[model samples]
Target: YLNTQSNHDKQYIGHAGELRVLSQRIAKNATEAAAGKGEAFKLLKDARNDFEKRWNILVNGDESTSLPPSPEAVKPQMDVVQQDWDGLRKNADSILASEQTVLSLHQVASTLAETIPQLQVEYEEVVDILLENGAPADQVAVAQRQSLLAERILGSVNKVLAGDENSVQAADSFGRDASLFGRVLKGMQEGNAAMSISKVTNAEAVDRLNEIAELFEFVSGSVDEILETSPDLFQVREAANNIFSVSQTLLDKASQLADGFENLAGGR
Candidate 1:
């Protein structure tokens, strides 16, 4: 009965969820680009493109993706996200111009970096509105939380890059983010009573979760490598790069897991 509408709603949620990931990624990459790190400029552009594309699909709807425009109930939340995006998009363009000094670019990148949490909350609010309207909420909850954790991991990496890589605050945050990410990933697959996350019973979702687990193995190892009291800046940068390389796929798979659950719920 709700399959069609539920799937459509889940697509909105999934894409909105992805926007949270992309916002952080754009900031992380913009910072790296300013530092003249490997392929940061290219990566920044790619994230920006995805950010814009998903925002368009959510706000304006895309026939190709079969996403309908935001309903009246959610327009206010969507508007807030748009306001935040405008600020981010303008600054991201400045970084793309490449005319500013590395210092100035870092300043600009900070502006972008700071907006990440706000942008994430805005998108999550949009997701909340969707859930309030009757989208089934169980399995999607795990995926949604995982996506947020992934974004935070990216933010911690950004903090590490911004200043002293060995700062106690930065190292602890990076370590904690990695630890939480691992815990949540485990909770989703095996069901953690303490965490209140249910075991993923859907066959396809189980498979997707396993694959994400595999990809996360290296990222977790990279985090361990950085947890030392005297962390290596080069190693930190490399971990950030590894995160940039894999985050999209991880986020996309999470979104798919949410979508799959929504579709499954609809069938019943």
Candidate 2:
């Protein structure tokens, strides 16, 4: 019985993390599509499809995914996510229609970029509710945290791409998010009491963390250079690209951790 509940809770975390990632991709790719990139539209569509499916599974439990019914405590949060998704979906259709100019598409992209953070926050709150409701902490818990950090980094960078945020604001946003990510990575590897995360003992997990850290440090410092020293839109765009580039590996490694953890929790 304990194992059943634990596995469900972990699946909840996994789904939530994927929601965060998919939202970020939708927002990021929306911008790319708006800028007249031919390939981005397909990517945007794929992400939207995935996100909608996840939302449906959350509202109505799916036996295949092993996702239980949404807890009453998380119902309000789920409602908010539903509302946000509906709003975003409307704009997404507009992008797909291709009837809008770059300016209009960019506006829609801004809406996407902004709305994802709201959804991300809601998702985090939902996870917190689960934890408070007796969800056992495990490897997936920390992996989900790492996944959120990746989403946040892209979210901050997305604002810059939207052309709404000032350079100083972009620097501050990206810098703060990246620093915390660095701090957490260190704590996860070495075990910091203040962070309340255990030191990872698995050599493969530790090695993966190190690889992610290297990518993070390079992009982190380079973005600092672009935003702080010189405010160049092209460079910022390139930095956003680098962040996007790094996120794939970063997220994949985190998902691997979550997978291993889930198997272990399931008594494999």
Question: Which candidate has the highest lDDT of all?
Answer: 1
Model 2 per-residue lDDT tens digits across residues 1-268: 3343456656655665686687678768766765547578788788878877876766787667566776655555555556556655655555655523433434533454554354345335434544555544654387567668768776665555444436447657777876786787788668888878777665555566666665565545545443543233333334335435444443554354345435545666
Worst 10 residues of 2 by lDDT: 229-238
lDDT of each: 0.60, 0.58
User: After superposition, which runs of candidate 1 have C-alpha atoms over 4 Å from their true positions?
Assistant: 1-6, 99-268
Give the lowest summed-lDDT range of ten residues in model 1. 229-238
Give one clash count per candidate, in the order shown: 0, 0
Model 2 stretches astray by more than 4 angstroms: 1-6, 99-268
Candidate maximizing TM-score = 1
lDDT of 2: 0.58
Model 2 RMSD, rounded to 1 decimal = 26.8
